[PDB]
Design a protein around this ligand. Structure first.
Ligand SMILES: [Mg+2]
Ligand SMILES: [Mg+2]
Ligand SMILES: [Mg+2]
Ligand SMILES: [Mg+2]
Ligand SMILES: [Mg+2]
Ligand SMILES: [Mg+2]
Ligand SMILES: [Mg+2]
Ligand SMILES: [Mg+2]
Ligand SMILES: [Mg+2]
Ligand SMILES: [Mg+2]
Ligand SMILES: [Mg+2]
Ligand SMILES: [Mg+2]
Lengths: 63, 354, 61, 107, 60, 50, 153
RNA sequence: CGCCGCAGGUGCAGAUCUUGGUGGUAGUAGCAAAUAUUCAAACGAGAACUUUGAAGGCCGAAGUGGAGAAGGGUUCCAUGU
């Protein structure tokens, strides 16, 4: 319903910004239940939350 | 469409087994309840034989789950019900001539068979018990006998309410305030179809109207008091808790998750008692109950010098006639009253049999 | 069980202090019950114990 | 019947001509929705997210001149709603737009 | 965790907890709440148990 | 600020506890003639003198 | 309560009202004037059309600055608008009035809006900020509304 | 309240009069400084604005980033309306 808290918690445990946190758009109810860490960590460990990769800034053109 | 009904021959037999297991446990206790005993000891031994007998039955099938549906609840001369102390609490030594109310539930594959009786302990041979206590429990039994005759699809729940009120007035007594008997089915104890005893304004405006339906389980109770019918709390720890599988909160305490894990494993949905653990049980309960993950069963005390009575049985509704599988050993020859029945309609329902 | 200043005035200071102590420990559990929910009965006995402490302290003073 | 699906090619260039830079791609997608509302007979046009990406593929002011889509009028017989028919328009990747007709795609 | 008077220092807090609860404490961490009342975290000695004591206190 | 004196924080403490709505049961008292806390304060609308 | 213009017969009539409704009084007064006298089904269909901007309401008294539209010719007039908020509040109050008619047992197929009036309500105060450190009002103009529907055919 | 006497802080259209309320203006001026939003879904009675995902963008390390000092004082955090 409203995952503002989970995004903040997931970014903190993932040690990444809120850009890089991916919450599963289909399993919104499951993430919405995770009101704490060790619940976010559980969701991270089973793949419902993924740290998105850094968008590529290649240096090949410069090289 | 997957709910189990009493239509099956195998289901009826074990339901007759549940009535036998309820009657045999009550019979074992009534003989073993005497003056100068430990109320805690009767509960542990009350549980003790109910563990073994439910383990030795049906040796050829050891797959389904069976056990307790409602803990051994006891209350003597001052409490309504929902009283079952822990080991740390002070014991209540049963004295001479007390009347004590005992409640117990047994579940087999989620089907609930629940019985509860009130009796006076250590009644000698040839004696005649008299007083205002001689009135309350006799009135309650006529509520039971009336209820047995009037339990049939077609007789409404509100007729049960007035009938119990009218006999209560006939016996100069009043039921305790706002209790609920329930219509039972598989894997449940808090059925939506409930019948209410001794209601008031808030109760009658929020209670439901419904007609008794066939092939159903009815856990009928009668709670009658000799005084005013009002109860409150005197700061005694609430022990009996039941989980609700509807709502959910994510526990943050290791003991609460462990307490909630152990509750789900052993007493998934039926009301349990904190005697089944104790150091970690008490501190895990506060967090779960705070977030209403468990619905409590508090203790209710009456006034000093007030007496309360209770009778509960489970009955199965067949089209041809109800049969009460669980009963308590009450006799009218050793127990009389000074006021009698005055209403003609009450007369008809007691002389008629089934 | 109520105490009165009139009957407290005969005792010595040895059990007057003793009576003040268990009166203080009783108020300690009373405030504990107030925090942990407790009951309406226990909350109402907070004042009756507070005035009993003042009564005993007034007599010794 | 009423479940049919067809394949169209919309000249966005013609429908978008004259629109300012910061409102071109936004206008292109309400022109697809207007196009679908007309060719099919139904309101409540549902635009596929892949179709969204194709219109925005080259930014906000350089919209593709033409796009090939597939309108699918399907039954809304899934929940109580005012409209019983809805059209879902998907994106069809193509190499050329030459000699492309409006064709009836089968099941 | 207790609520104590703002005029009591960690030494009196340790002495009060030790004497009126019959326990041995390891250290006291104190802070004053925004409400204006002191909050004392009393770490018990390893041979004592907080849950054991909190039962006897009644705050379990 | 984070750096405060004791007496300032004690001053701020009292102002916090008395910025609370009146109890609902006050309305039921005989001869009440009180309706709301008219001395309520909001941190953004009106500032403490200190 | 005391409605103005009580019905001729409070047995084939139904009433509804609302007070302190957060709608513009000028927009609702025009909307009620067009609705007045309409049959219940014609008025309900018309108010949905105004929301859909397929039919308009003519602004006759409070028209200063109101623009012109083509649809304001059905009503002999020039300027009209499509007050969405006024239509929704009148639709809600018409639905309440219809349920009252079925409550006292008259058919809703033959209901006609005999009387409908909109009254100014107490204004609500807000603040706007002007150039040289000046404070100016930002008052709202709510409205009381009430109508009587008469069963007639 | 009338009648005989007594005594006045005794009569309003104005004073750019004091206080309060209300109009026309007027559904009007206006809600135009700093490039920009779009698609689907969820909750929900209700979605241009909430949340999730996808895309297109902007700040571009002298930041629209991360922390503090004064100042504020609970605005911090959960849950609900
Ligand atoms: Mg410090
Ligand atoms: Mg400011
Ligand atoms: Mg003009
Ligand atoms: Mg301004
Ligand atoms: Mg200024
Ligand atoms: Mg004058
Ligand atoms: Mg005057
Ligand atoms: Mg004047
Ligand atoms: Mg304008
Ligand atoms: Mg503008
Ligand atoms: Mg840039
Ligand atoms: Mg906040």
């Amino acid at each position: 319903s409203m995952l503002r808290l989970q995004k903040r918690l997931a970014s903190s445990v993932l040690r990444c910004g809120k850009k890089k946190v991916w919450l599963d758009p289909n399993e919104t109810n499951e993430i919405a239940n995770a009101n704490s860490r060790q619940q976010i960590r559980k969701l991270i460990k089973d793949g419902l939350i993924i740290r998105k990769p850094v968008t590529v800034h290649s240096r090949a053109r410069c090289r | 469409q997957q709910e189990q009904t009493i239509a099956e021959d195998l289901v009826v037999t074990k339901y007759k087994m549940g009535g036998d297991i309820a009657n045999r446990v009550l019979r074992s206790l009534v003989e073993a309840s005497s003056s100068g005993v430990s109320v805690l000891s009767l509960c542990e031994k009350g549980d003790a034989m109910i563990m073994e007998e439910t383990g030795k039955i049906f040796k050829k099938e050891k797959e389904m789950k069976k056990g307790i549906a409602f803990p051994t609840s006891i209350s003597v001369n001052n409490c309504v019900c929902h009283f079952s102390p822990l080991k740390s609490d002070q014991d209540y030594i049963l004295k001479e001539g007390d009347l004590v109310k005992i409640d117990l539930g047994v579940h087999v594959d989620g089907f609930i068979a629940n019985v509860a009786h009130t009796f006076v302990v250590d009644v000698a041979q040839g004696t005649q018990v008299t007083g205002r206590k001689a009135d309350v429990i006799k009135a309650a039994h006529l509520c039971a006998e009336a209820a047995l005759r009037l339990v049939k699809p077609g007789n409404q729940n509100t007729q049960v309410t007035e009938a119990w009120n009218k006999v209560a007035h006939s016996f100069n007594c009043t039921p305790i305030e706002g209790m609920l008997s329930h219509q039972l089915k598989q894997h449940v104890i808090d059925g939506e179809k409930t019948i209410i005893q001794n209601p008031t304004d808030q109760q009658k405006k929020d209670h439901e109207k419904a007609e008794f339906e066939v092939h159903e389980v009815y856990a009928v109770d009668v709670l009658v008091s000799s005084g005013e019918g009002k109860a409150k709390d005197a700061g005694q720890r609430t022990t009996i808790y039941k989980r609700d599988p509807s709502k959910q909160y994510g526990l943050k305490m290791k003991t609460s998750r462990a307490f909630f894990s152990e509750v789900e494993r052993r007493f998934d949905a039926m009301p349990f008692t904190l005697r089944a653990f104790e150091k970690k049980a008490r501190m895990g309960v506060v967090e779960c109950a705070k977030h209403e993950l468990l619905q409590p069963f508090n203790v209710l005390y009456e006034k000093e010098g007030e007496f309360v009575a209770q009778f509960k049985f489970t009955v199965l509704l067949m089209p041809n006639g109800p049969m009460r599988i669980t009963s308590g050993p009450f006799e009218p020859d050793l127990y009389k009253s000074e006021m009698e029945v005055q209403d003609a309609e009450l007369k008809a329902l007691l002389q008629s049999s089934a | 069980a109520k105490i009165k200043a009139r009957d407290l005035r005969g005792k010595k200071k040895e059990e007057l202090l003793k009576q003040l102590d268990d009166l203080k420990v009783e108020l300690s559990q009373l405030r504990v019950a107030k925090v942990t929910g407790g009951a309406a009965s226990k909350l109402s006995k907070i004042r009756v114990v507070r005035k009993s402490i003042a009564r005993v302290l007034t007599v010794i003073n | 019947n009423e479940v049919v699906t067809r394949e169209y090619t919309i000249n966005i260039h013609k429908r978008i001509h004259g629109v300012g830079f910061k409102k071109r791609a936004p206008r292109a997608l309400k022109e697809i929705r207007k196009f679908a509302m007309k060719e099919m007979g139904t309101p409540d046009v549902r635009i596929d997210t892949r179709l969204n990406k194709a219109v925005w593929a080259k930014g906000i002011r350089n919209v593709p001149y033409r796009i090939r889509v597939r309108l699918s009028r399907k039954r809304n017989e899934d929940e109580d709603s005012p409209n019983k028919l809805y059209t879902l328009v998907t994106y069809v990747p193509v190499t050329t737009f030459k000699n492309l007709q409006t064709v009836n795609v089968d099941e | 965790v207790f609520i104590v008077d703002v005029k009591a220092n960690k030494h009196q807090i340790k002495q009060a907890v030790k004497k009126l609860y019959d326990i041995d404490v390891a250290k006291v961490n104190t802070l004053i709440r925004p409400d204006g009342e002191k909050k004392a975290y009393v770490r018990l000695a390893p041979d004592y148990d907080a849950l054991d004591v909190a039962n006897k206190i009644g705050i379990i | 600020s984070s750096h405060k004196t004791f007496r300032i924080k004690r001053f701020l403490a009292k102002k916090q506890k008395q910025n609370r709505p009146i109890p609902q049961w006050i309305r039921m008292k005989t001869g009440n003639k009180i309706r709301y806390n008219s001395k309520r304060r909001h941190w953004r609308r009106t500032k403490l003198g200190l | 309560v005391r409605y103005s213009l009580d019905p001729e017969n409070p047995t084939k009539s139904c009433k509804s009202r609302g007070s302190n409704l957060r709608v513009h009084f000028k927009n609702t007064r025009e909307t009620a004037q067009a609705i007045k006298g309409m049959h219940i089904r014609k008025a309900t269909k018309y108010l949905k059309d105004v929301t859909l901007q397929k039919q308009c309401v003519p602004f006759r008294r409070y028209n200063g600055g109101v623009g012109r539209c083509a649809q304001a010719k059905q009503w002999g007039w020039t300027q009209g608008r499509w007050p969405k908020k006024s239509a929704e509040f009148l639709l809600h109050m018409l639905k309440n009035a219809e349920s009252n008619a079925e409550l006292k047992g008259l058919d809703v197929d033959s209901l006609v809006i005999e009387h409908i009036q909109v009254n100014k309500a107490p204004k609500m105060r807000r603040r706007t900020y002007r150039a040289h450190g000046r404070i100016n009002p930002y008052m709202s103009s709510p409205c009381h509304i009430e109508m009587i529907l008469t069963e007639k055919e």
